[PDB]
Design an enzyme around this catalytic site. Sequence first.
Site, PDB file in Angstrom:
ATOM      1  N   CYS A 240       0.857  -1.193   0.000  1.00 51.72           N
ATOM      2  CA  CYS A 240       0.000   0.000   0.000  1.00 51.72           C
ATOM      3  C   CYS A 240       0.892   1.242   0.000  1.00 51.72           C
ATOM      4  O   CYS A 240       0.927   2.003   0.970  1.00 51.72           O
ATOM      5  CB  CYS A 240      -0.903   0.006   1.240  1.00 51.72           C
ATOM      6  SG  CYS A 240      -0.030  -0.134   2.823  1.00 51.72           S
ATOM      7  N   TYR A 284      -0.822   3.503   2.652  1.00 51.48           N
ATOM      8  CA  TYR A 284      -2.078   3.910   2.008  1.00 51.48           C
ATOM      9  C   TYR A 284      -2.154   5.397   1.679  1.00 51.48           C
ATOM     10  O   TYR A 284      -3.236   5.920   1.397  1.00 51.48           O
ATOM     11  CB  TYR A 284      -3.292   3.547   2.876  1.00 51.48           C
ATOM     12  CG  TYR A 284      -3.484   2.066   3.113  1.00 51.48           C
ATOM     13  CD1 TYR A 284      -2.967   1.450   4.251  1.00 51.48           C
ATOM     14  CD2 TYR A 284      -4.179   1.279   2.196  1.00 51.48           C
ATOM     15  CE1 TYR A 284      -3.137   0.085   4.473  1.00 51.48           C
ATOM     16  CE2 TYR A 284      -4.354  -0.088   2.408  1.00 51.48           C
ATOM     17  CZ  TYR A 284      -3.831  -0.677   3.548  1.00 51.48           C
ATOM     18  OH  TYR A 284      -4.001  -2.025   3.763  1.00 51.48           O
ATOM     19  N   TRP A 302      -2.442   4.689  10.457  1.00 48.70           N
ATOM     20  CA  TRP A 302      -2.075   4.830  11.858  1.00 48.70           C
ATOM     21  C   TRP A 302      -0.859   4.004  12.267  1.00 48.70           C
ATOM     22  O   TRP A 302      -0.573   2.962  11.676  1.00 48.70           O
ATOM     23  CB  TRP A 302      -3.277   4.473  12.733  1.00 48.70           C
ATOM     24  CG  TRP A 302      -3.049   4.724  14.180  1.00 48.70           C
ATOM     25  CD1 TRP A 302      -2.833   5.930  14.784  1.00 48.70           C
ATOM     26  CD2 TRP A 302      -2.996   3.740  15.216  1.00 48.70           C
ATOM     27  NE1 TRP A 302      -2.648   5.755  16.135  1.00 48.70           N
ATOM     28  CE2 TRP A 302      -2.742   4.421  16.426  1.00 48.70           C
ATOM     29  CE3 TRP A 302      -3.138   2.346  15.238  1.00 48.70           C
ATOM     30  CZ2 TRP A 302      -2.626   3.753  17.650  1.00 48.70           C
ATOM     31  CZ3 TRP A 302      -3.022   1.682  16.454  1.00 48.70           C
ATOM     32  CH2 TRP A 302      -2.768   2.389  17.644  1.00 48.70           C
ATOM     33  N   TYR A 507     -10.532  -4.017  -5.779  1.00 45.81           N
ATOM     34  CA  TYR A 507      -9.379  -3.647  -4.961  1.00 45.81           C
ATOM     35  C   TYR A 507      -8.076  -4.161  -5.562  1.00 45.81           C
ATOM     36  O   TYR A 507      -7.964  -5.336  -5.912  1.00 45.81           O
ATOM     37  CB  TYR A 507      -9.540  -4.184  -3.536  1.00 45.81           C
ATOM     38  CG  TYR A 507      -8.477  -3.708  -2.571  1.00 45.81           C
ATOM     39  CD1 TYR A 507      -8.458  -2.389  -2.117  1.00 45.81           C
ATOM     40  CD2 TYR A 507      -7.488  -4.576  -2.115  1.00 45.81           C
ATOM     41  CE1 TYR A 507      -7.477  -1.949  -1.228  1.00 45.81           C
ATOM     42  CE2 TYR A 507      -6.503  -4.146  -1.230  1.00 45.81           C
ATOM     43  CZ  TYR A 507      -6.504  -2.834  -0.791  1.00 45.81           C
ATOM     44  OH  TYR A 507      -5.532  -2.410   0.086  1.00 45.81           O
ATOM     45  N   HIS A 508      -7.101  -3.259  -5.671  1.00 38.62           N
ATOM     46  CA  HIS A 508      -5.771  -3.542  -6.220  1.00 38.62           C
ATOM     47  C   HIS A 508      -5.690  -3.641  -7.744  1.00 38.62           C
ATOM     48  O   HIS A 508      -4.765  -4.248  -8.285  1.00 38.62           O
ATOM     49  CB  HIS A 508      -5.168  -4.797  -5.568  1.00 38.62           C
ATOM     50  CG  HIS A 508      -3.942  -4.522  -4.750  1.00 38.62           C
ATOM     51  ND1 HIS A 508      -3.429  -5.432  -3.848  1.00 38.62           N
ATOM     52  CD2 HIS A 508      -3.113  -3.451  -4.715  1.00 38.62           C
ATOM     53  CE1 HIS A 508      -2.337  -4.931  -3.295  1.00 38.62           C
ATOM     54  NE2 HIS A 508      -2.124  -3.731  -3.803  1.00 38.62           N
ATOM     55  N   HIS A 593      -4.132   1.454  -6.101  1.00 35.09           N
ATOM     56  CA  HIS A 593      -5.188   1.760  -5.135  1.00 35.09           C
ATOM     57  C   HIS A 593      -6.149   2.892  -5.516  1.00 35.09           C
ATOM     58  O   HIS A 593      -6.658   3.583  -4.633  1.00 35.09           O
ATOM     59  CB  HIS A 593      -4.562   2.071  -3.771  1.00 35.09           C
ATOM     60  CG  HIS A 593      -3.940   0.883  -3.103  1.00 35.09           C
ATOM     61  ND1 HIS A 593      -2.806   0.265  -3.582  1.00 35.09           N
ATOM     62  CD2 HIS A 593      -4.301   0.199  -1.991  1.00 35.09           C
ATOM     63  CE1 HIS A 593      -2.493  -0.749  -2.794  1.00 35.09           C
ATOM     64  NE2 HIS A 593      -3.385  -0.810  -1.821  1.00 35.09           N
TER      65      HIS A 593
END
Length: 651
Positions: A240, A284, A302, A507-508, A593
Site C-alpha cells: 500500500c 495507504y 495509523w 481492490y488492487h 489503489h
Amino acid sequence: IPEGSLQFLSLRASAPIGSAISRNNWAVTCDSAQSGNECNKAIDGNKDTFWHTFYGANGDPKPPHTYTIDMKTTQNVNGLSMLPRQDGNQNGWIGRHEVYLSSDGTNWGSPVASGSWFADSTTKYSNFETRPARYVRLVAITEANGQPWTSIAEINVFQASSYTAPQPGLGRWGPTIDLPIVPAAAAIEPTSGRVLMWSSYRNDAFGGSPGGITLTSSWDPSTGIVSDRTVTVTKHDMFCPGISMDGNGQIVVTGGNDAKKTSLYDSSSDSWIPGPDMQVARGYQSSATMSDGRVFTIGGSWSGGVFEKNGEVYSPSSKTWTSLPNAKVNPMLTADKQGLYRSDNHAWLFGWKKGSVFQAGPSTAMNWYYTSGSGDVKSAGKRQSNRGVAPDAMCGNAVMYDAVKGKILTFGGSPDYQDSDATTNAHIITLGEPGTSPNTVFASNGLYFARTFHTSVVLPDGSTFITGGQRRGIPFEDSTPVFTPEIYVPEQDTFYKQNPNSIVRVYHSISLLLPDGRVFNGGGGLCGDCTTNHFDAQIFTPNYLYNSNGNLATRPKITRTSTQSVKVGGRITISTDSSISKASLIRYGTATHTVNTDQRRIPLTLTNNGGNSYSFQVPSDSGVALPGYWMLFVMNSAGVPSVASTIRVTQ
Ligand SMILES: [Ca+2]
Ligand SMILES: [Ca+2]
C-alpha cells in the site's frame, strides 16, 4: 493443499467466471507427442499424467508447439486453464503463449489472449472476453526455461453463463495480456515506452514471510512481449505505497508495510534501487509531484504511538526527505468509522502553482497545501453543488482533464473504506490561484453505476475513461462488480456507457493510458491462496480508433518534431501528414489503489504555419505543466488521435 510453494513465491491464480466444459466428446490434436505422453493425456482427468512433445529418440523439436481442441459443439468460451506437470520436473512448462478461438477450426484469427505464465507448478489461466466457438487452440511460444519441449498435465476450457455481442460505436475490449504477477501497481515507463508492473509478496498459506521482496514484470506494446518475473530484495514491503514520477521522470515508491522506505526505479538498468527513508511512517498515502520537480506526500494510516502524519517533501537532487509539520493532515481527514487507520488514505492530490498541492478529496473538505518553510494548509471550501454537499468519497477517483483551465473531474467512492455503499456522485472542480476556494458543480446527472475501487484515465481528446469497481467496497472480494465502463465527455457534460467486459477489477486493480491511445486495465487481488488474484490485464480500444465499418480508422501522423525536450513556456514545431484540428499533452501516469497523481492533460493552442506545419507553446507555469515526461497527441477533424510522441518538459 494450497497452490505452489513459498520456495517459488507462489499465489493462486484467478479463474474466469464460468464453468468447465465437459471434455468427454472432445477431439484433441497436437504438433507432436511422445509415446506414453499422448495428447489425450492432457484431458484424462489424471493430474499425474501429461502430454509431452517429441524428445529423446524422436529428436527435440523446438517451439512453437500447439494443442488444438474440437469441442464438437459451439460454446460461449471465456477462458482456459493449464495445469503443468506435477512431478517436480519443469521440462515443458509453458512460458510465452497465445490462445485462439474459432467457429470452423480453420480460421483462427488473432489471439484472444497472449502473454507469459510464471514458472511454477500452479494452475495457470487465460481469461478473456466471451466469444462463441467450437474450437480452441493453445500455442506455446516458449518454454519456461528456454528448452525445446512443451507439456501439459490437464487442460480445461470455460464457458460463460451467456453471450451478448458488443454494440457498434461503444469501443472494444481485448485482447487479454497474461502475466506472471498480479499487477497491483503500474506505470508507463517513459524511456522504454513499456508498461511496468509490480507487487509485493505475501501468502499466509505458507506462513513465515520472506520479507522485503518486490516482484516485477513488464509488457512492451511494440513487441507484445511480457518479460519474465524478477524478484528483487528491496527490503521494501510495499502492498500500500504512494507513487509519483518526479520532474526527471523517475518512479518514486513510498511506504507500505515497511512504512518509511523509499524505492526508485532506475530505468537505464531496469532495477529497483534504494532511496532515502521518509521522516514519517506511512501506508495507504498519496504522493504528488510538484511544480519544482520535488515530491510531496501527506497522510499515512495509523502507527503504534502518537506520531502525526503531516506532510513531507522529497528532493530528487539532494536525495532527502524533509518534514513539513505545519502542512497539517487534520483538515483532510474523512469521518471513516475506522478512524485514523483510514481517514487520511488516498488523498486526491494535484501539484499546482508555486509549490502548492491541491487536495480535492476524498474528504468533503478540500484544502490547499504549501511547501515553503515548514509547510502550511488553507481551506478551499467543500466539494458540493446545487444538489448538496458531497459526502466523503474514499477510493473515488479524481482526474485533471484540462490543467490550463484547472478542471478536475471527481466520481464514485464510498463514505468508509470498506463495508459501505459507493455512490454515483460526480463533480467538476475549477481551480484558480492557490488559496482561493474553487467553484464546484455536479457532473451531468452523475455516474450510470455507483462504484468504488474503480480506476480511470484521461484520454487524448479530453474525455475520461472510467472502469471497474464494485457497488460495495470489500477488499479482496469480487462481489457486486461493475462490468460496464463509462466515458465522460466534457464539451457535452455527458457520461456514455461503453461495451462491458468479463473480468472483475476491484481492490488492487489499475488503469493507464498507453502511448498508442488505448487503455491498459488490469490487476486486482493479491491475497495469497485466495481465488481473486488476477494475473492479467485487458486492452480497451476507444471508439475514436474505429470507423463506421468496424475497422481501424486512419490516424493522423506526426512526421517530425523540432525537439523532444522543452522548457516550460517553450515552443515546439511539428509536421503532420495531413491537416489536424486539435492537439494535447498528457503527462505519463502511475497507478495503484485508485490513485494516479501523475496523469493530467493540457489542451494545446496551435499556430498554423501552413504546409501541415504547426507549433505550440507549453504553458509557462510549471504548476500546470508539471515537469517530467508527457505524450503529445494530435487529432483530426473526425476526432481520431495520432499515437503519442514523447516530450520531456523541464524548468
Ligand atoms: Ca493428465
Ligand atoms: Ca530500461
